[PDB]
């Protein structure tokens, strides 16, 4: 209940080793290149803002 309500001790927490020495900023965590058609032979894009044409009772059948 109310773990750290008292909030005085901060603004002087010294820089970590990876901070000052600049070992953390070596991210090297780039996202993979976006494919157009997957290796499994399935196209994977994301169409958006398509006007929804509702549904039809024929779809249940």
């Amino acid at each position: 209940m109310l773990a750290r309500k008292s909030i005085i001790p901060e603004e002087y927490v010294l820089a970590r080793i990876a901070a000052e020495n600049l070992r953390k900023p070596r991210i090297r965590d780039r996202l993979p290149k976006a494919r157009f058609i997957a290796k499994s032979g399935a196209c994977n894009l994301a169409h958006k803002n398509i006007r929804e044409q509702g549904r039809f009772l024929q779809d249940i059948f």
């Binding site: 010294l14 820089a15 901070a19 000052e20 020495n21 600049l22 070992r23 900023p25 070596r26």
Partner: protein, 239 residues
């Protein structure tokens, strides 16, 4: 034309009260190297700031018309004061200061700033975090980083204030003079250098003087040296 700034102020002073920049007129040539130098104690830094627009102008007249000029200085003038300011980021990020990366511009500025051994001796090179909350350096190094950041920009106008005063040595001052000549002169960037050492005034396109107020025009050195102030010539040549 050549004049990049224009002022005729009766007073542009700090705070409120008695003026400190009273009764001045000035003009900065385009592509100049105006060496605003005077006795240490009055005028220089406050003049540069009030020109930037950070003082309580009491009797100034609005005039800012560069080459094709205008809305509040209309442009970005690089700057570096008598005290450096650094981001808490990598040296490369610090120097770039939010601009397109350019190995040509960056490499030329690194060579022209002579900071290479410092960068090499740091544990990670230009990828090392600098500034407060990081590896702490010496005053000359910080001066060099600041002036290098102010060098690599896209600003036709430029400003400085005692960039050699805290340099490592007068030999480093000669090196910085050489770099400024090699890089700044290759372009047509308006530079207004200020330094208490009068020896370096090569290609002085203008000379503004300050002693509790402006002395005379930013004219060439030849007309200056015998413009009814011979004590100026004696003092500058003697030292």
């Amino acid at each position: 034309e050549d004049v990049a700034i224009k002022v005729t102020n009766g007073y542009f002073s700090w705070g409120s009260g008695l003026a400190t920049l009273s009764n001045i007129d000035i003009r900065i040539p385009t592509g100049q190297l105006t060496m605003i130098v005077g006795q240490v104690g009055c005028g220089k830094s406050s003049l540069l700031l009030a020109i930037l627009g950070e003082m309580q102008t009491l009797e100034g007249k609005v005039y800012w018309n560069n080459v094709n000029e205008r809305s509040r200085s209309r442009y970005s003038v690089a700057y570096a004061a008598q005290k450096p300011w650094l981001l808490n980021a990598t040296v490369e990020e610090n120097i770039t200061f939010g601009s397109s990366f350019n190995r040509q511009r960056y490499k030329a500025v690194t060579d022209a700033c002579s900071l290479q051994p410092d960068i090499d001796l740091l544990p990670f090179g230009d990828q090392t975090e600098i500034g407060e909350r990081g590896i702490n350096l010496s005053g000359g190094q910080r001066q060099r980083i600041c002036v290098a950041r102010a060098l690599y920009q896209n600003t036709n106008i430029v400003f400085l204030d005692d960039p050699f005063s805290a340099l490592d040595i007068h030999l480093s001052d000669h090196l910085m003079q050489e770099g400024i000549l090699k890089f700044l002169q290759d372009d047509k960037r308006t530079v207004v250098l200020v330094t208490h050492k009068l020896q370096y005034l090569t290609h002085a396109d203008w000379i503004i003087a300050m002693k509790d107020g402006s002395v005379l025009r930013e004219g060439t050195l030849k007309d200056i040296q015998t413009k009814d102030v011979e004590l100026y010539e004696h003092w500058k040549t003697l030292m």
